[PDB]
Amino acid sequence: KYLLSPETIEALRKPTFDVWLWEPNEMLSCLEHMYHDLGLVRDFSINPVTLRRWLFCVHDNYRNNPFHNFRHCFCVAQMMYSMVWLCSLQEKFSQTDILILMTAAICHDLDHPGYNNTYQINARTELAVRYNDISPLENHHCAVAFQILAEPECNIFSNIPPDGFKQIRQGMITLILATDMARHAEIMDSFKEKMENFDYSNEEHMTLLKMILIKCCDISNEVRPMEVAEPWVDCLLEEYFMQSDREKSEGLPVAPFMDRDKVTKATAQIGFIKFVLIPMFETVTKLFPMVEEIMLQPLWESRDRYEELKRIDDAMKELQKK
Amino acid sequence: KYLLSPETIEALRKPTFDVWLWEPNEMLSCLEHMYHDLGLVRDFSINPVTLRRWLFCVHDNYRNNPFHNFRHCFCVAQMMYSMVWLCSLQEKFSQTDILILMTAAICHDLDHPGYNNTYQINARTELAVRYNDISPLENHHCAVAFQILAEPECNIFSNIPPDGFKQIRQGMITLILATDMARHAEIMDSFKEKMENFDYSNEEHMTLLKMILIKCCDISNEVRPMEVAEPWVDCLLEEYFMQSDREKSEGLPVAPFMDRDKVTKATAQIGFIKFVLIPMFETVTKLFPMVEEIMLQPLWESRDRYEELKRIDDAMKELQKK
Numbered sequence A, B: 001k002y003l004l005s006p007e008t009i010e011a012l013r014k015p016t017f018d019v020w021l022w023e024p025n026e027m028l029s030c031l032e033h034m035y036h037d038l039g040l041v042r043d044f045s046i047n048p049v050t051l052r053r054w055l056f057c058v059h060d061n062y063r064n065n066p067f068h069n070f071r072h073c074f075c076v077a078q079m080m081y082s083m084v085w086l087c088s089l090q091e092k093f094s095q096t097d098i099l100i101l102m103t104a105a106i107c108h109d110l111d112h113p114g115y116n117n118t119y120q121i122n123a124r125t126e127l128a129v130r131y132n133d134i135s136p137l138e139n140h141h142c143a144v145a146f147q148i149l150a151e152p153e154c155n156i157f158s159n160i161p162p163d164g165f166k167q168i169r170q171g172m173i174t175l176i177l178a179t180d181m182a183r184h185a186e187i188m189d190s191f192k193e194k195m196e197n198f199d200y201s202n203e204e205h206m207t208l209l210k211m212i213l214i215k216c217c218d219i220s221n222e223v224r225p226m227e228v229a230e231p232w233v234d235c236l237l238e239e240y241f242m243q244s245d246r247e248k249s250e251g252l253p254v255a256p257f258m259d260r261d262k263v264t265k266a267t268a269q270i271g272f273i274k275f276v277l278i279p280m281f282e283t284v285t286k287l288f289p290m291v292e293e294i295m296l297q298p299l300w301e302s303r304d305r306y307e308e309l310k311r312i313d314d315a316m317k318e319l320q321k322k
């Protein structure tokens, strides 16, 4: 049953929203609500019907991978929606910037194949050869994003003038490309430097803030409730094993964190929560104090839980080895 | 024709080479000779039969556009060859670096359509949407170069280890992407920054020098003798007029420097020589003083010759005025 209850629309605004509850049509409708509710339909004369066909286009072009699937895209877009409200971003950003933040979130892993950059490059694929080993998947995601938008029936921007299309497009590209974890250190070091004296009337500081926001949402699964978050780790590792199978039986290098024999659910997250998630949301909390209690808080609770799980896993491996 | 005379082999080593005398047959055999003579076939275990097939395929993947054709390809690699000897590059650069320089120069405009990046982006071409407005032609040149090299019958790198291939791929990519003239000032400023106190054991200083070197060869046509240089100006304007005419009938922006109402042969070369070519070769001359007499001298004469021809143009216009 598409058509959402008023209870659902309420829940949808917070990062506690149970993303697993809903089937695709309900998620499409949830996303459709977001565009209306943020005033993007109103302020960019988006045809209400074109909006629905666009979300169906997008959905069709996400794949049935275990992790990089349409449900991931909904998580990231819904988490961006939560962040608009939590941080009150309509006070600091234009409606163009919100449109970029939302449309980039929805489009940022379009047609992900289930194998990451390092596979693409080492196997010398169609995509690595096409994009010269430079963020190949991330370029592919934008390419597909705008190939969808070039179809008149899927074009939510059809009544935006050329200058505004040009600005959105640039913005969307900057953000979708920023999702490549290869650049996490570079992007964070850029941001932290700008943060020494932040200025919202500085376009360059704001371009970085948006980059950090989409990144925050992209890797945001562990910010959610333990019940909601925990199943994404199986989805990740299942996808990661799929690749490291292929890498072994093709003789390509294998990343320790994708190695069946090495990684566990617990050791996948301890490091990620501690040295990627926590520091990123720590920096962002300076700019938005309310982030601490809502987002940084479940990250401490997740860190503490996954370190306990490791103590039990490790204790259990003392029984196994011969 | 093919089977090059000892005289042709000697004249091929210098910037004075009459690039117009030779049909595709002979230019290929020349390029081939360059690889044997520079010790690239020897030092990289290149199969000389594969070398011939690669070159035929490269040549096949250049288009019959007025300016950006196989002959332009030949000029850039031939000018690179000249510079190797003039600047004694084998005393400063590794054989791997020479391989990167020659192979990049040959490959740098593969499958160029005859309309520049500004066309691609304003007409929203497959290429522009594919490459996210980011140097769409240059990325595509690289893409075509390594599609070709992925075919085993065209693969001149087939006996190089993977480590070496990765290093060459990366190097060629940097160079080909450096030929986008939109980055000329950025690249020159980055080069000039290092040039304050240059260092050949600094790998980044070298990476820029190689970017400058291919840039020099890419736009070097005015360095060649005045009989050889001048018909290339007609080829250029023919291509640019072909684009400005399309831009006019398609309702797209037109660039003054490409307008067939506004631009003369002389106005097309004066600014370009005085403010792009000359300062670039001036900066190279500091590192290689011998460049002044052999390359900056013909540029000076061409500037003078074209500045005089504008004074003729301008006085003929004053008689026209009624």
Ligand SMILES: C[C@@H](Nc1nc2c(cnn2C2CCCC2)c(=O)[nH]1)C(=O)N1CC[C@H](F)C1
Residues within 6 Å of the ligand: A181, A218, A219, A220, A221, A222, A236, A257, A267, A268, A269, A271, A272
């Ligand atoms: C085992 C892996 N753990 C991990 N990776 C994630 C999450 C979300 N997204 N991702 C990647 C990165 C973006 C796409 C999928 C997450 O909750 N945990 C890790 O530590 N790393 C660190 C390097 C790499 F980012 C994965």
Ligand SMILES: C[C@@H](Nc1nc2c(cnn2C2CCCC2)c(=O)[nH]1)C(=O)N1CC[C@H](F)C1
Residues within 6 Å of the ligand: B181, B218, B219, B220, B221, B222, B236, B257, B267, B268, B269, B271, B272
């Ligand atoms: C009229 C044009 N003149 C010009 N352009 C050239 C030459 C060689 N290569 N090129 C371009 C560089 C990339 C494509 C071919 C040359 O001898 N003269 C100009 O003034 N400009 C201003 C900058 C723009 F690149 C061309």
Ligand SMILES: [Mg+2]
Residues within 6 Å of the ligand: A108, A109, A137, A179, A180
């Ligand atoms: Mg991704």
Ligand SMILES: [Mg+2]
Residues within 6 Å of the ligand: B108, B109, B112, B137, B179
């Ligand atoms: Mg070019």
Ligand SMILES: [Zn+2]
Residues within 6 Å of the ligand: A072, A076, A108, A109, A179, A218
């Ligand atoms: Zn993602």
Ligand SMILES: [Zn+2]
Residues within 6 Å of the ligand: B072, B076, B108, B109, B179, B218
């Ligand atoms: Zn060129």
